[PDB]
Amino acid sequence: KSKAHKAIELQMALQGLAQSAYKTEDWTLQDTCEELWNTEPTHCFKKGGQTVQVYFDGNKDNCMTYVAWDSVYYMTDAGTWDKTATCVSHRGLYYVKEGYNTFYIEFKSECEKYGNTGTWEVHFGNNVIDCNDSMCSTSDDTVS
Amino acid sequence: KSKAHKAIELQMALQGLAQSAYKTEDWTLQDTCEELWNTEPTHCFKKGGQTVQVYFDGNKDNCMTYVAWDSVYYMTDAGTWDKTATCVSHRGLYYVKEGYNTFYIEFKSECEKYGNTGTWEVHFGNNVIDCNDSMCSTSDDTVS
């Protein structure tokens, strides 16, 4: 099985996470399971899921939902674990990885799946995220 | 590597644990790591390590230390996870598995390693465990 390898990658990641600066934070069994590990953004740990609603075309129906993680844990090339927030823009969901915006969901490609108008509206909680800005948790390298 | 298989066993165990009645308890990265997983009692999860001191022969020196887990999580044949305490007797450390005392450290075999007198004294905290009794945490199937 190609999964036999997956369990191995996850284990090594957890070994690193266990020695990282975030080992003191609360980590549930769910936070560390394979299912989540293989969920976008992959190769990362994430906590604090937040619902992002996207409306394609000018219709409240046909409303797709996505999860924006309050905290995203990625590993630098050096192999060190950093913690950052998920950013929600009209373009999609991303996290800054070593200074660069990294998307794990592109709303344009998502609109090509549902929404002939090629138009979509992003809602995050009680805020409509259009413009060139975006919302994100306040999470940073600081340990919880 | 024979370890590649280990990571797999641990993962499946964690999948079961994640669905068990104890998934709500606090589980640290340490509690779920491979190193501990392969520590006695194996194939079990354990938390609340407690120091057990054993003195071989009539000497305070040559004092061996062992860990008695406040809570031992084993899986029944049916595959369900149960939680119980570690028992500290003069014979060794054990946990009751489906009504039967199960040792994961035998002090007699341990004395054969250090202590020609074939005699040993067991201390658990502020109590000397001789007689035919033993001390143990109050942990039971109840979730923390």
What CA–CA distance (Å, rounded) separates A92 from A83?
Answer: 19
Which residues does B125 contact at the CB level (< 8 Å), separation at least 6?
A: B50, B51, B135
3-state secondary structure of B35: helix
Q: Furthest-apart CA pair in chain A: how many Å?
A: 48
Chain B contact residues (CB < 8 Å to A)? 4, 7-8, 10-11, 14-15, 17-18, 23, 26-30, 32-34
Nearest to A17 among B18, B26, B29 (CB): B29
d(C-alpha B1, C-alpha B3), whole Å: 5
Distance CA A41, CA A74 (A): 9
Contact yes or no for A90/A129 (Cβ under 8 A)? yes
Q: Which of A17, A10, A7, A46 is nearest to B12 (CA)?
A: A7
- Cβ(A84)–Cβ(A141) under 8 Å? yes
Chain centroid offset of residue A108 CA: 17
Supply angle C-alpha B15, B17, B20, rounded to 5: 115
Rg (CA), chain B: 16
End-to-end CA distance of chain B: 37
Q: Which of A1, A8, A23 to mutate to test the interface with B (most CBs of B within 10 A)?
A: A8
B100 is written with which tokens? 């039967």
Nearest-CB residue to A27 (from B4, B23, B29): B29
> In three state form, how does the secondary structure of A52-106 look?
EEEEECCCCCCEEEEEEEEEEEEECCCCCEEEECCEEECCEEEEEECCEEEEEEE
CA distance A10 to A16: 10
Count other Cβ atoms within 10 Å, centred on residue B95.
26
Q: Where are the alpha helices (DSSP H) in B20-125?
A: 34-37, 107-111
3-state secondary structure A13-61: HHHHHHHCCCCCCCCCCCCCCHHHHCCCCCCCEEEEEEEEEEEECCCCC
Cβ–Cβ below 8 Å for B17 and A29: yes
Contact B27, B88 (CB under 8 A): no
In chain B, the domains with their CATH numbers are 1-144 (2.170.200.10)
Experimental technique used to determine this entry: X-ray
Q: Which residue has the tokens 């201390």?
A: B123
* Cβ within 8 Å of residue A111, ≥6 positions away: A56, A118, A119, A120
Rounded CA-CA distance A123/A134 in Å is 10
Measure the CA–CA gap between A86 and A103, rounded to whole angstroms: 9
Residues A78, A84, A89, A93, Cα dihedral to 10°: 60
By the 10 Å C-beta count (0-12 exposed, 13-18 middle, 19+ buried), A57 is classed as: middle
Radius of gyration of chain A (CA): 16
What is the count of residue pairs from A and B with beta carbons less than 8 Å apart? 47
Of B133, B20, B36, nearest in space to B83 by CA: B20
Does residue B94 contact residue B87 with C-beta atoms inside 8 Å?
A: yes
Q: In 3D, which of A89, A63, A99, A85 has the Cα closest to residue A144?
A: A85
CB A17 within 8 A of CB A24: no
Residue A132, helix vs strand vs coil: coil
